[PDB]
């Protein structure tokens, strides 16, 4: 067991941060900004590794593809771009959807990337097939806000949608395995998987102020977490600690106990609205990072 002991590792002021991600083996965080800029920071030495003026439009989605030394970003010009973060070379640059890109997910073992879009679809791209579009998942009836592979079975993934559903799909299958009606009448902003095999759980966040935990075997709602006072931008399970982290346009991060679902901490990090979240994939120092209107902060949770 490990006690909560929150330490501010690194904080950096900037334009609004829309996407944020951890590098799995370097002490780096990637941020994608509403200004069209993206930055990689070493949060342990507090040194900027690289910055790129990618576009003039907001860059909403960004992920490391560490095993190719890439970052992949999606922006409101409808385009996916890939950059080598060691050289700055632009690897590819294509219009992926005819509308905004909301979310990007990277398959852990196969050369697949998912993009969720306001065009009501999720699309699957294969970078070992010249970034071919291998599948478009159709069936949602509003903007697809968030996509996430099941870490315990990456042949499936979940899409959260403003049509108030989460759909779980299988690669190569045109119809979803199942559709969760969330009861979150304002729609689903975010979806995330519980990482460990002891619970088949998922978590959703909504503008209706609720965070809901779902059992994807029983398709039932396990718990509803209330406490935020404005739109909940995200909610995720921590990969190694028994906690949930959420962030809201009310300016706060909340840390919840993942067994009792009681709020343990409410943090005003002082950067106004909270928009995005990342956790270190292997729990290194239990790092988390969140992007806000006015920058991002990296915290060690214990």
UniProtKB/TrEMBL annotation:
Stated family: Belongs to the WD repeat COPB2 family.
WD repeat residues: 10-51, 94-135, 137-179, 197-224, 225-266
Function: The coatomer is a cytosolic protein complex that binds to dilysine motifs and reversibly associates with Golgi non-clathrin-coated vesicles, which further mediate biosynthetic protein transport from the ER, via the Golgi up to the trans Golgi network. Coatomer complex is required for budding from Golgi membranes, and is essential for the retrograde Golgi-to-ER transport of dilysine-tagged proteins.
Domain of life: Eukaryota
Subcellular location: Cytoplasmic vesicle, COPI-coated vesicle membrane; Golgi apparatus membrane
Record note on quaternary structure: Oligomeric complex that consists of at least the alpha, beta, beta', gamma, delta, epsilon and zeta subunits.
UniProt source species: Saccharomyces cerevisiae (strain Lalvin EC1118 / Prise de mousse)
Protein name from the UniProt record: Coatomer subunit beta'
